[PDB]
């Protein structure tokens, strides 16, 4: 009946399926694919009325840290307590989608690779991650914005974890 709205990338929908038997890419499922704004909202809306985590990542690029996009890269981490699963973490969830599918960062929106949100009985976690840990202009630019959209109290920062240091782990690059 109408024409459909195309986003300025094409998006995959992962997610991660906790199976202890298995090595950890062996968990991993490309669910669906997407292009336009009508079709990001019909799964987006599927999704809500249905550590069992997901990951929205541009089109070729795999949820982690081995692909050639994001092995140089790293995250910005938004760490919620227990507390925050029921008051915030739909609201910061779709708000994160929306800076990713609407390019919110602007020419900076080019470093974006994804976001990855951990679902955790411990606490939740959500995650943008970018291409470039040394590219600081970009990176900086990213967390400011994001910060100020999900409407983070000033004082308290988030982190930004290089990728190399995450998978090498026994800290925070930037921070905002
Ligand atoms: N090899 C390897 N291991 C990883 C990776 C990774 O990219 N590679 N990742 C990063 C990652 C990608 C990703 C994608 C989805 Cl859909 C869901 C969750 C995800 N987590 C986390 N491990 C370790 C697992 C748990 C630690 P923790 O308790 O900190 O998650």
């Given at each position: 009946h109408y024409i459909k709205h195309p986003l300025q990338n094409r998006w995959a929908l992962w997610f991660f399926k906790?199976?202890?038997?298995?090595?950890?890419?062996?968990?991993?499922?490309?669910?669906s694919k997407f292009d336009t704004v009508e079709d990001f909202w019909a799964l987006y809306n599927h999704i809500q009325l249905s550590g069992c985590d997901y990951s929205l990542f541009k089109?070729?690029?795999?949820?982690?840290?081995?692909?050639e996009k994001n092995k140089r890269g790293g995250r910005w981490l938004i760490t919620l307590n227990k507390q925050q699963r029921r008051s915030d973490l739909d609201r910061f969830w779709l708000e994160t989608l929306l800076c990713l599918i609407g390019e919110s960062?602007?020419?900076?929106?080019?470093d974006v690779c994804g976001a990855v949100v951990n679902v955790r009985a411990k606490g939740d976690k959500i995650a943008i991650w970018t291409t470039?840990?040394?590219?600081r202009e970009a990176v900086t630019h990213i967390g400011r914005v994001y910060k100020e959209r999900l409407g983070l109290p000033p004082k308290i920062v988030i982190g930004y974890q290089s990728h190399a240091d995450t998978a090498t782990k026994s800290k925070n690059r930037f921070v905002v």
């Open positions: 906790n199976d202890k038997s298995k090595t950890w890419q062996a968990n991993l499922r490309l669910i089109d070729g690029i795999e949820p982690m840290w081995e692909d960062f602007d020419d900076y929106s080019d470039e840990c040394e590219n």
